[PDB]
Subunit: 387 residues, 4 copies
């Protein structure tokens, strides 16, 4: 019934709550956590109490039953403070996503119910050292032996890997190398305390240092037949489904980071003065902030559209990819320009802009790299012109 | 409620009409009109009687009483067929805008009222050989002489110049050089058949060759005091506001040209075959096609935002300039990439793309060049950090 | 032995000759030939006598013996005035290259010599309506029936195609659809007079409108066994080698057009004033002219190096393709920025810049489009890493 | 006379020496020094004995008395191994550039002589917390007290400051602010152990972390008369001269980093397989690599040109600025793309590319930011038309 760019009073309150938290509780300690690299437990507990965590969990499982548009709205406020921290919080939504859209009443009740009861964490296990962008190439095995599957393999770059209470695991169940991807993998929910799960050490990355990233080995892990999501073989579609519903929020985190660098650079441009004039008075630096503004705004509407698409019951693969490709890219651009506007100071650890550049980079790599995001769009676009 | 990216049933119906028209009536003749540079009188008459023109004219004066959002929607379809014809049609909305926003009852009934009676044209006269972006630097003057104003000066690049029934004229009334912009100009309605007016020849340009662009000389043009819009000195304000309402629409025209270039490039990539596979099979071209869809999609959302903003009673200055700046630029990008994908044929005059590349260019020039758009966004952005 | 960026006295002379011809004779008439499209016969003749045309022909064949470097510094000076004229004149060298790098004395003074006696033109008939970038996709058949070769096929986009005394024709002789490039095409030298040949009409293009571009059908044309170049299955090596000699030159013409673009804009920026000051005194404009100067500077050095390789006796395919890709692109970027700097005037036909924008486009298509250049560089690059 | 793109045999030697050293001694340890931020003394001392360190010191002072071109050649190689080490090594040559181009032989033998005897380091003190780019805005005072000057001020971001034996210091003598830049500053040479000098704590930056970077306070530091550079008041053109002479070697550094990023990414691309192909076989990846190559090759030529010009006895301002702006820009474009190509591994500390991304940023800042370089290029450009 007409276009609208106005939030509901409910969404307005969520954003307020998320914003207050990011500024008063996240920003002050963001650097601390980035230097040390320690899991931000206090901030995660707090976000959990304010209800800015596990917003997709259904109401009948003690959750808020919020949609994607809502999750994006909160995520961007959270990223503004620190994407290293928000990635941890978001790891939960991603790891629990495949259950929200495909698990049954009993699975949802058990694995989603515990998340609402106490600040538990969960992860998403799909990537492997040999296959990331190419999901169809993951080799972690899952042998149907009796009333349990025996999982065997090595997963890599898992967010919340060594902090998860349980995992969503994508494994190959069909041993025939000619088996279609849409019938060869199975989704399992495996409790982290199962004997045979060897959690590796914390990986030292360039940015998002406080986020927990690890590799895991699954040496003859036994999973009950009840933890299979839809059935043997349905794993691929559940994975690709979770991604579609999550890309808008990953696009939202990047916009938050971009917005942070824009605010930082602008505030400095108003304080610094060279060649007798304020930085903001040099036509070049004003064009820079101008273009930086255009980018954050455009990227924002990108995910707002993509999020709306999913919430309206429409297929959003196309829009969500535009959002992820665009937002991820401009986040990186704005981060670099932010440190540039800050001169020697921006390259220094005493300033916040330097860290954003480091954090920005993964927005072009995880969640489907910029290259696969363009493949998707080109695919959803061209198909419109065929028959 | 919250966000919505859905048209109303009446908007979908406008879109359908404009689409059918551009598809069946404009596209077929677009090439001939660009070649001959002949004013598309027939197409303008059809659009007029289809109700796809003079959409802002209030219903109390015979118009439809539509808003900017609706104008944008119709305009993107018209531009898809030909931006030359669309520009001709948009000149009217630009000429009538100062009257719709600042005219009194008697002025609207008289000057708008007849646009409803016949397919008449009008123009927006403010640019000059010495001034375009710097509106405050125009030198055409108006001397109060009894019950008349005697205008003296020359305007340049007036779209629908020697085709208008009447004009909107911005002229300087305060002779004092150091007088402020907000009180030195006056906006008049000048009937075409007034004696001192001398229309120039058709200006031959590179793009939108069938639109009537030309300069005009006013040598002791007497204008009734009745014809001043708000009053002596209120001219600058009326012009700056007219630009705000019309910018999202000129941006909408840039998206139309862009979508045309995309359709053409895509249709050809699904048919031309190089190195044993369709162009769409070569990842480079697929990536090319991807970013093209990406750009146009984000551009469309930017003009929709700027249009919604104003209809809701907001100062849309910030969103309108982002729209016009972005859309103006992506239109040129898509246009050049479209001919590129068509190779040697793309450069040939018998193919629809070269004309798109030529038309696109003014989108960064008129209605506020790409530079002054960034100038505005910077201005609008910095204020929010000053206090 | 030691880097040197200086020309030899002889070269410095050639440059000043081509320059005066360009700026005193070509420039005052470039506009007219663009508007009419008619072949600049006079300009081509005047250039012949000055020695600017057919520079590569050997001293023994009456020619001057100029190397590639010299051809480049001459082409750039000509193209500065008009890429249209420069292209027709350049069609000669291109059509001669195959006979120069792979012909025998007899063939040499038969074909090059005449070219020394009269201002005759030649063409390089390689591309076809169905195959442009994919040389191996060439379908023009050539069968050896006794002491001769009967040839049937069609060409498309041949410069000097209907003004050529003799042509260079590449055609497949090995019917076997799996005949390697290597051993599947034969290069000939077929004079325009041989019955069976038929020049199509003149193609109207968006730019370099005075240049002669037409298609040629070869409907049962016989070529004497002697007018074959190096033999059977020799044709492919020849064309690639020719290309390889000319890419630097097309890159030179492109750099020529860009210099003209940067000159016009800079001069306009030093006269036009907006908001009190000259255009140049606005940072966004100075920064524009600066990057326009950078782009051109780098492009010039790129072609000079590509030219040096071939002359130094070294292969140049890597630097060649780096040179044409960069040069062809920047030429387009400069041309459009120049139009922008001139504002409304730049978009008008009474101003020089507009033509440059229409001309520049082919510098990204003919002589190996921007995509295959990227493909050639990539392969030349990757190659030196594996083993 | 004649263009030449080939080093002399001597230069080839230097290249090989700097190459073997960087790739066999710097590379294997650059990772450690990066993490630890420890001054690479072993590496610096070794460079010193290899004869790659004070390459500009005139023979009569024990030095090799090499020119800029040779310095660029050597620097690009040291940088390939690591720009943190290279910077410390480069800090000396920058710091002794004024003495070289302004010192009287008595000062020369004393200061440039030490360097020839022991690995002595030096620094270039010009930037201060209040100004870096706006050089003429420095506030460190120099006060004449007979045959000596008393300095008071504070510098910031000094390379090798805290490790330098002596400092080249630019301070403002004339207190009359209405005094021109060309007669307001005086350059000095000061023993690093003079009372009043308070070296600050090492700064923790994002890039070239083993490179030493500190601030310094001059609290009543006494400087003898004979330690002034051309005369009192000539210090502004002396600093500006050194800049023009060093800029190309800063560009060479960037290019070194770009080659590293290029090789590092091409090698990975030749082994990493996704979707059953090597990354190199995915057209979008090879196109990426082709453009990475293009940028490096051009950036190399720009610094060679700039370096030649200076060694040719002519002003290189225009080309030096074209070189530093371009090289610094693309070095970052390659650094980021190198990370992209290695994907998840690229963002991880276990791989080389990440460090390159953190190092590359400074090249757009120090040695004159990307903004000021363009001001210079534009300045030199419009000037060629001004007359
Ligand atoms: C910090 C971090 C956290 C992560 N967290 C998670 C997590 O919680 N859960 C999870 O399951 N995964 C996670 N990942 C993995 C992440 O999603 C993958 O890194 C990403 O999908 C890229 O995969 P890769 O590194 O294997 O890239 P590769 O596939 O090796 O690709 C390398 C390069 O080649 C390009 N390329 C590959 N295929 C093509 C093609 N067809 N066409 C063109 N270019 C191509 C890629 O775009 C990239 O540029 C995380 C990664 C990181 C670094
Ligand atoms: C086909 C066509 C139709 C038009 N129709 C109309 C119409 O109906 N009515 C009407 O009134 N006008 C019309 N115009 C005129 C158009 O509005 C002006 O050309 C435009 O707004 C300003 O361009 P100019 O020629 O005045 O350029 P200039 O103001 O001279 O500017 C030239 C260049 O310098 C840049 N520049 C200028 N000032 C600055 C600055 N402060 N900082 C940085 N960069 C700057 C500009 O962006 C541009 O790139 C039309 C023009 C064309 C070509
Ligand atoms: C005025 C003019 C004069 C010319 N004069 C001559 C002449 O004298 N002699 C002559 O032989 N030719 C000449 N040509 C032809 C010109 O060289 C070809 O147009 C050009 O080589 C491209 O071929 P195409 O036009 O068939 O385009 P196509 O090969 O159809 O390609 C179309 C698009 O697909 C892209 N593409 C193709 N293959 C790939 C791939 N594998 N990966 C990615 N992208 C790809 C191309 O880059 C282009 O963007 C001329 C052309 C013009 C317009
Ligand atoms: C690691 C490191 C090492 C260094 N080593 C040395 C050394 O040995 N010796 C030394 O003396 N200095 C050194 N410096 C300092 C260096 O020269 C300055 O950082 C640099 O010139 C930038 O000055 P600034 O940082 O004060 O930035 P500012 O002058 O504050 O400028 C900040 C930003 O605004 C932009 N800007 C400013 N004015 C304009 C304008 N007019 N137009 C457009 N954009 C503008 C700048 O380009 C930059 O993007 C070093 C710095 C670093 C970080």
């Amino acid at each position: 019934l007409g276009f609208s760019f106005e939030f509901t009073e409910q969404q307005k309150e969520f954003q307020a709550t998320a914003r207050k938290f990011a500024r008063e509780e996240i920003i002050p300690v963001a650097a601390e956590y980035d230097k040390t690299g320690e899991y931000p437990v206090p901030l995660i507990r707090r976000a959990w109490e304010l209800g800015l965590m596990n917003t997709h969990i259904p109401e009948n499982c003690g959750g808020l039953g919020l949609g994607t548009f809502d999750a994006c709205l909160i995520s961007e406020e959270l990223a503004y403070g620190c994407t290293g921290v928000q990635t941890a919080i978001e790891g939960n939504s991603l790891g629990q996503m495949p259950i929200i859209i495909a698990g049954n009443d009993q699975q949802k009740k058990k694995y989603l119910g515990r998340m609402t009861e106490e600040p538990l964490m969960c992860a998403y296990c799909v990537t492997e050292p040999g296959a990331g962008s190419d999901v169809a190439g993951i080799k972690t095995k899952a042998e149907k032996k009796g009333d349990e599957y025996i999982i065997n393999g090595q997963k890599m770059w898992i967010t919340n890997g060594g902090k998860a209470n349980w995992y969503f695991l994508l494994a190959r169940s069909d041993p025939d190398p000619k088996a279609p991807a849409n019938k060869a993998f199975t989704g399992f929910i495996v409790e982290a305390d199962t004997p045979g799960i060897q959690i590796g050490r914390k990986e030292l990355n360039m940015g998002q240092r406080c986020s927990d990233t690890r590799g895991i080995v699954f040496e003859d892990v036994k999973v009950p037949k009840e933890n299979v999501l839809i059935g043997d073989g349905a794993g691929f579609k559940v994975a690709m489904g979770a991604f579609d519903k999550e890309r808008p929020v990953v696009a939202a985190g990047a916009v938050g980071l971009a917005q942070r660098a824009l605010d930082e650079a602008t505030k400095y441009a108003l304080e610094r003065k060279t060649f007798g004039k304020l930085l903001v008075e040099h036509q070049a630096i004003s064009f820079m902030l101008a273009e930086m503004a255009m980018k954050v705004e455009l990227a924002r509407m990108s995910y707002q559209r993509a999020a709306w698409e999913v919430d309206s019951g429409r297929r959003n693969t196309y829009y969500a990819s535009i959002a992820k490709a665009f937002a991820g890219d401009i986040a990186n651009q704005l981060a670099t320009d932010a440190v540039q506007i800050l001169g020697g100071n921006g390259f220094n650890t005493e300033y916040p802009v330097e860290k954003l550049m480091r954090d920005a980079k993964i927005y072009q790599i995880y969640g489907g790299t910029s290259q696969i995001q363009r493949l998707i769009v080109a695919r959803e676009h061209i198909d419109k012109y065929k028959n």
